[PDB]
Amino acid sequence: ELFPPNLTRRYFLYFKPLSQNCAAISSKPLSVRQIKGDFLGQLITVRGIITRVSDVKPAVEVIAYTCDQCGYEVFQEVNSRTFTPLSECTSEECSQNQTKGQLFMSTRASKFSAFQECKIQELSQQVPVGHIPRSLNIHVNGT
Amino acid sequence: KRRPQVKLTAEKLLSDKGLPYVLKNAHKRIRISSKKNSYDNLSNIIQFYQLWAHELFPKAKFKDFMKICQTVGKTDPVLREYRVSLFRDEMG
DNA sequence: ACACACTCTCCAATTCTCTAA
DNA sequence: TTAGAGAATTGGAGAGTGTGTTTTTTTTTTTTTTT
Numbered sequence: 338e339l340f341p342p343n344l345t346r347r348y349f350l351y352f353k354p355l356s357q358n359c360a361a362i363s364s365k366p367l368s369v370r371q372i373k374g375d376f377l378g379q380l381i382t383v384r385g386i387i388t389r390v391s392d393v394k395p396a397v398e399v400i401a402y403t404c405d406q407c408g409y410e411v412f413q414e415v416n417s418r419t420f421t422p423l424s425e426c427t428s429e430e431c432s433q434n435q436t437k438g439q440l441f442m443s444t445r446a447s448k449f450s451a452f453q454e455c456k457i458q459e460l461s462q463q464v465p466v467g468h469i470p471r472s473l474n475i476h477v478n479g480t
Numbered sequence: 481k482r483r484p485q486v487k488l489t490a491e492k493l494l495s496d497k498g499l500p501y502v503l504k505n506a507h508k509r510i511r512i513s514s515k516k517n518s519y520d521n522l523s524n525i526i527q528f529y530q531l532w533a534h535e536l537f538p539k540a541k542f543k544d545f546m547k548i549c550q551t552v553g554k555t556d557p558v559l560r561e562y563r564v565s566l567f568r569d570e571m572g
Numbered sequence: 573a574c575a576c577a578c579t580c581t582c583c584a585a586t587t588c589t590c591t592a593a
Numbered sequence: 594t595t596a597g598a599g600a601a602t603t604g605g606a607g608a609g610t611g612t613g614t615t616t617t618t619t620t621t622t623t624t625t626t627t628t
């Protein structure tokens with residue numbers, strides 16, 4: 338494909354859990370202690386108090402470059418927490434002209450998305466005797 | 481084997497993309513004026529040839545394009561046949 | 573194992589030289 | 594005077610090898626036990 342489809346998605350998408358009065362696990366709140374390792378991958382609901390909130394900063398989704406000699410643009414998609422930027426124009430037309438041009442990054446055509454990180458902590462009146470309260474990390478994107 | 485190298489060659493020049501474009505357009509491209517300086521008009525002549533040279537073969541520096549053209553221009557018989565054909569067209 | 577620094581090797585691109593038409 | 598056949602010199606493509614990385618105050622705000 339010419340470019341990744343993520344570059345032109347102008348919208349965000351979220352799920353809303355089942356109503357408990359129609360009800361399933363997603364409708365039944367869990368305290369932060371009850372979130373065992375079985376739940377990894379599932380959609381759940383959590384009840385607690387927020388402890389701290391970070392301020393907003395951007396995060397890359399698709400990065401854009403420019404090749405100086407052959408005047409051609411290429412894209413890169415980022416998912417992991419880190420990445421290596423490109424440094425060689427591997428385009429077939431650019432290669433067959435033996436045009437070992439240099440790539441440069443551009444913000445004006447890259448795609449960002451807003452990011453924020455928070456932390457949630459169990460209610461004090463639900464802590465069993467002699468234990469220290471536990472907490473979870475929350476991530477938030479989009480609107 | 482490693483990939484063979486890519487070079488300028490008389491086939492590119494004799495292609496429709498090549499030298500016929502210059503003779504089809506040079507009368508319309510360049511324009512001298514006594515109303516502008518020697519440096520001005522001299523700078524004007526090299527624009528079209530530089531852009532044409534880039535469009536033909538983006539490999540190398542502009543001087544290298546000219547000095548590469550010298551060799552194949554002197555050696556190749558088919559190119560010389562085309563050139564005597566041009567000057568015969570003017571003799572026609 | 574994943575980016576780097578450095579070493580080694582082969583092959584063909586290039587120019588130089590000699591010969592004859 | 595052109596050109597084409599053969600020899601010598603050089604470039605860098607690219608393949609290979611080895612390597613490195615995770616990890617006693619001194620000053621100042623606040624809670625607590627001690628005279």
Ligand SMILES: [Zn+2]
Binds near residue numbers: 404408428431436
């Ligand atoms: Zn390029």
